Amino acid sequence: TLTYPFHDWSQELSPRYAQLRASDAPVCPVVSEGTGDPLWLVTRYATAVKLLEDSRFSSEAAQASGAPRQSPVELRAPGTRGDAIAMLREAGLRSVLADGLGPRAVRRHQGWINDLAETLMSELASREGTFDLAADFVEPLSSALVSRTLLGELSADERDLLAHCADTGLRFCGVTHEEQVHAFTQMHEFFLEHARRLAGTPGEHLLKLIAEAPVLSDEALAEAGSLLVVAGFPTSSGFLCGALLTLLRHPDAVQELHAHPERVPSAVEELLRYTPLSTGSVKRMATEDLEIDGVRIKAGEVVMVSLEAVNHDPDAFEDPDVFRPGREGPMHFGFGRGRHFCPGNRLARCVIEATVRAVARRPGLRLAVAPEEISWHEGLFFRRPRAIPATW
């Protein structure tokens, strides 16, 4: 009877999560709002760990055509394959991905990322009055991350196009079915025309390393660009927006980090636990009849895990709704878990850290409006406020 998602577009999670957690079963049935498909939803940490480490619950099978799904529309450019990451790992690109996303890449980029983040805060601190941390800080920083580390050199107009596509394609509601599908077609056709060129521009960005990988056609490249937009653009920008909100609402913790810069890493990891991002769930499909903490899951059925509900599980985390850097509980779910642990985790932790440090070097940064007055994009997969009015 319960339809999904829960329309908790702001940082205030839906009460339903705590409700499902407190229920009897470790999985609860819900119904997709966008398609009427029946779906299983996991909200408890213990269950989620079991589910995400059991590779018999498949991620790639969860998007074969005909799959039950939480999204109103198939999240691909029509005609195209999908699961670009499986396509890329299957083409023997793991080590390439390691170079473009791993500690080697972090090393290449951590210098400029931190420089950029400090310049943006500097420029903002040398103004009189208030300013918009979303537009004036997050947007250029996440834009530069996507450009410099993932796709290659983007113009302002190309950046705007892909950001619109992500905001239009990656929604539960607010756009027609055909608008949403059209966003993926737009992205696809942009990368069909440009992936080659973006690959060849200067720097050491992932898309170029993929193109120079021995084994990739324009089609394959285009599918890689789309995947990298979807996985790294609206995620990074959403997350940093929410992290800045979390930080500005916790001056005490900010002051602690100002006095103790060695506590910032623990702080980033608490941010990934505390700050919500996605409004939907990671999802997998039972590749056979399976049993989840006693619940029988039939082949073909799809099991969702809300990382938000799991990150806020009190059985796992003491005082789960409090911001506590240096807390010592289990591992957070902000990046998932298991074989599909976000490969973007190093670059995302890089940029997250650069941001937490720029803020902590400048105590007194605060909201210029009440948290309740912040305006949210409604219907997005990845939460993002319209603006973050802030000031010193």
Per the annotation, where are the binding residues?
A: 66, 89, 284, 340, 342
**In terms of DSSP bridges, do strands 290-292 and 131-132 run parallel, antiparallel, or are they unpaired?**
unpaired
Nearest-approach distance from CB 142 to ligand HEM, in angstroms? 9
Q: Name the segment binding ligand HEM (CB under 6 A); options: 103-111, 178-186, 187-195, 337-345.
A: 337-345
User: Of 20, 15, 111, 29, which Cα lies nearest the Cα of 68?
Assistant: 29
Q: Name the segment binding ligand HEM (CB under 6 A); options: 10-18, 42-50, 110-118, 226-234.
A: 226-234
In sign, the C-alpha dihedral spanning 253, 259, 334, 278 is positive
**Per residue, what are the HEC states of 317-328?**
CCCCCCCCCCCC
Tokens describing residue 94: 């793991």
**Could you tell me which residues come within 8 angstroms of residue 92 by beta carbon, excluding any fewer than 6 positions away?**
213, 215
Q: Other CB atoms closer than 10 Å to residue 103's CB: what's the count?
A: 11
Nearest-approach distance from CB 212 to ligand 2IV, in angstroms? 27
Nearest-approach distance from CB 266 to ligand HEM, in angstroms? 17
Q: Name the segment binding ligand HEM (CB under 6 A); options: 130-138, 186-194, 234-242, 317-325.
A: 234-242
Q: Which residues bind ligand 2IV (CB under 6 A)?
A: 70-71, 235, 277-280, 282-283, 307, 381
User: Of 359, 385, 391, which Cα lies nearest the Cα of 373?
Assistant: 385
Kindly tell me which of 26 and 344 has the beta carbon lying closer to ligand HEM: 344
Q: Name the segment binding ligand HEM (CB under 6 A); options: 36-44, 287-295, 338-346, 360-368.
A: 338-346
**Could you tell me which residues come within 8 angstroms of residue 68 by beta carbon, excluding any fewer than 6 positions away?**
32, 35, 37, 38, 39, 300, 301, 302
Query: Which one of 231, 290, 369, 387 is in contact with ligand HEM (CB under 6 A)?
Result: 231
Helices and strands (DSSP H and E) totals, the chain: 15, 11
- Supply the DSSP symbol for 56: T
What is the pattern of x (binds ligand HEM, CB under 6 A) and - over residues 179-218?
----------------------------------------
Binding site for ligand HEM (CB under 6 A): 59, 85, 150, 228, 231-232, 235-236, 239, 277, 282, 307, 334-336, 340, 342-344, 347-348
